[PDB]
Scaffold this active site. Sequence first.
Site: not given
Length: 302
Positions: A41, A143, A145
Site C-alpha cells: 500500500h 510512517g 510500516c
Amino acid sequence: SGFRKMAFPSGKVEGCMVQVTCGTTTLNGLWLDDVVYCPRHVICTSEDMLNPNYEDLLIRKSNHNFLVQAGNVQLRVIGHSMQNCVLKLKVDTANPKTPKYKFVRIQPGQTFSVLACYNGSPSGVYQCAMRPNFTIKGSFLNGSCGSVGFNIDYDCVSFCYMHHMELPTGVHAGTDLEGNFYGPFVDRQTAQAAGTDTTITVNVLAWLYAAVINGDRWFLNRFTTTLNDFNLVAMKYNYEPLTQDHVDILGPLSAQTGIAVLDMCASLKELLQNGMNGRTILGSALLEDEFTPFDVVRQCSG
C-alpha cells in the site's frame, strides 16, 4: 541474576532498512541482496486506502515511479512484482551489509524483536509476541510500516514480521516476508475485528520458572494438580489449553529448578483463583505471557 524483557541486537537488521517512496506515499523497506521488500500500500493514496484494487493500482505504476533511498544513496529500481501484500522492488545494487537471513512464518505465542523505523532510519528496538489472535501490541506511529520483526540464531537473522496497519482498537497487524497476513486481516482502511485474545499459558509458566531462578518463590504452593483439572481453570480465565508438548518444552526448566511442571501449574491455578494480594513477581503485578521457554533459557544461561 536479574530478568528483564530483552530484544536481540539490532545491528544486522539496521543495515537493511531503506526508505521507499512512491508518488506522495512513503514508508520503510527491507533491502536484502538486490531486492527491497515493503508493504504494497505504498502505491495507495489516502483515498485509495478505503477500497484499493491493488492489481489495477499497480498497473498504473512503472519502475521510475519508485524511489528507494538508503541514507543518501539512491537505489535504481529495475523490476517490480507483487507477492500477496508485499511489493518486491528489484534493484541494480546488491546490499553489501546483507546478513545471513531466512524468511520464517512464526507460530502464535512465539516472540520476536521489532526494529521500529521512520524514513528508513531506525529509532528503537523492543520485544513482543504473536498474540493467539495473530495481532501484536507494539509501538507504531505513522510512517512506521515496513518495520520488520526478527530473531537471531548466532549469525542468521530470521525475519518473521512486517508492519502493515494499526487496527482501530490500538493493536497492530502485519505479514510475514512472503506477504501473507497473520490472522484474518486485509490491507484496507476498514473496521476489522481481532477477536478474543487469550493468554499464552506455556509462556506464563516459563516466566514463573524464571522468577524461581531469581529468588522470587512465594507463589510456590503446597498443592499439585492434573492437566485436565488445570485446563478447566484455564478455560474460565481465557488461557490457552496446556498440552503435553508444552510440558515437554518446559522440561529443561523443570530439571534446572527441580519443580515438576504440574506443581507450577497448581501454583498458577491458585494465582488465577486468588489473585496476587498486592504482591509482585519479578517487579510485575500481573502475569507476563510474552516470554517463551526459549526466551527464559536465553537469559538464564547467556
